[PDB]
From a paper:
A proteolysis-resistant complex of AnRpf2 and AnRrs1 (Rpf2-Rrs1 core complex), comprising residues 18–262 of AnRpf2 and residues 10–113 of AnRrs1, was crystallized into an orthorhombic P212121 space group with the unit-cell parameters a = 54.1, b = 123.3, c = 133.8 Å (22). The Rpf2-Rrs1 core complex structure was determined to a resolution of 2.35 Å. The crystal contained two independent Rpf2-Rrs1 core complexes (complex-1: chain A(Rpf2)-B(Rrs1) and complex-2: chain C(Rpf2)-D(Rrs1)). The structure comprised a wide, twisted half β-barrel in which 10 β-strands were surrounded by four α-helices and two 310 turn helices. Rrs1 was composed of a single long α-helix (residues 52–74), four short β-strands and a long C-terminal loop (residues 88–104). Three regions contributed to the molecular interactions between Rpf2 and Rrs1. These were the long α-helix (α1), β-sheets and C-terminal proline-rich loop (residues 88–104) of Rrs1. The amphiphilic long α-helix of Rrs1 formed both hydrophobic and hydrophilic interactions with the wide β-sheet of Rpf2. Two β-strands (β1, β2) of Rrs1 joined the central β-sheet of Rpf2 to complete the 12-stranded β-barrel structure and the other two β-strands (β3, β4) formed a three-stranded β-sheet with the β7 strand of Rpf2. The long C-terminal loop of Rrs1 wrapped around the side of Rpf2.
Author numbering:
A (entry chain B): 17 to 104
B (entry chain A): 19 to 254
């Protein structure tokens, strides 16, 4: 009720929760008045806030003896294979 | 060893060239730790290996260790502190990229480490954040390749389930907004995630800086033949 859990930027974040991934397409803000690591840390904090919000909000949660588990959607970012698709 | 319909974690080979400097070795060690248990660290002082001259020996070591990815440290006058990332498809190199390690913020350097942090379990899946507009540019083949490679490198073993307790750390790969005439720069930073109560049902996120703080300048790129690439992109 007093500290914001929402981040807003001109361009919205995108997500690939299957890879636990978030994209912040907004320009990387690196002000000269501030140390690099601080700016990077701020951007990162915003992005991880967004990513965690998305994970907790949009994923199915299952609580059991196996623990508290998020169900992740299949990875949307397609990556190259190591070995060719097997002989059928 | 034989083709599988669903491949597991892409195995990673980490090795280095002649007289590779200490920061690069630290990077190789940390990367080795982050890709545990599906990585291989070769401590040989390898010489005569020059990937952009020939990927043959590279392919040999990678295939002999059944690795789909190779991280090769090297250094010379023209290209100092060079980290070469190469992917292997069908026993040959698919695509390749150079990342040249930039000097520290100014005068601390890169501390010697063998792992990311004592506050982070070895082999945990990272949260990943790609910040900057370059990652969203479909015409920048460099950033497309780098994003693909980095996700491929650090995704570990993907699964449709994850414990809420496993969400402990994040990797940010920030692409500096590019300028004409200059090679693109990227920043890699790791953070321990600390969640505080915020009043809302969603927790407030704060970060703790952890691990090495890496700044890279992109060097040479070797793209994959569209034939080979589209063959590699086919999902079963």
């Amino acid at each position: 009720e007093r500290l914001p859990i929402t981040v807003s930027k001109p361009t919205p974040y995108t997500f690939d929760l299957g890879h636990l991934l978030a994209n912040d397409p907004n320009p990387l803000e690196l002000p000269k008045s501030e140390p690099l690591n601080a700016s990077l840390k701020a951007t990162a904090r915003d992005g991880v806030q967004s990513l965690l919000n998305q994970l907790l909000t949009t994923c199915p949660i299952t609580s059991s003896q196996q623990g508290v588990l998020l169900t992740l959607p299949a990875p949307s970012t397609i990556l190259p294979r190591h070995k060719p698709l097997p002989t059928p | 060893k034989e083709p599988q319909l669903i491949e597991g974690a892409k195995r990673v080979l980490l090795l280095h060239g002649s007289k590779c400097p200490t920061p690069l070795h630290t990077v190789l060690k940390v990367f080795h730790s982050l890709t545990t248990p599906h990585s291989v660290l070769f401590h040989k002082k390898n010489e005569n290996i020059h990937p952009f001259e020939s990927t043959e020996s590279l392919e040999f070591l990678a295939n002999k260790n059944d690795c789909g990815m190779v991280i090769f440290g090297s250094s010379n006058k023209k290209r100092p502190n060079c980290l070469t990332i190469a992917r292997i498809f069908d026993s040959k190199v698919l695509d390749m990229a150079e990342l040249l390690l930039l000097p520290d913020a100014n005068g601390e350097g890169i501390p010697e480490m063998n792992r990311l942090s004592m506050h982070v379990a070895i082999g945990l899946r990272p949260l990943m954040l790609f910040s900057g507009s370059a990652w969203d540019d479909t015409t920048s083949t460099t950033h497309t390749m780098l994003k693909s490679m980095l996700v491929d490198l650090f995704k570990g073993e993907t699964s449709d389930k994850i414990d809420v307790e496993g969400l402990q750390y994040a990797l940010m790969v920030g692409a500096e907004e590019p300028t004409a005439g200059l090679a693109p720069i990227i920043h890699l930073r790791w953070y321990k995630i600390v969640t505080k109560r915020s009043g809302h049902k969603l927790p407030r996120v704060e970060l703790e800086e952890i691990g090495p703080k890496l700044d890279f300048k992109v060097g040479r790129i070797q793209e994959a033949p569209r034939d080979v690439m589209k063959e590699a992109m086919k999902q079963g």
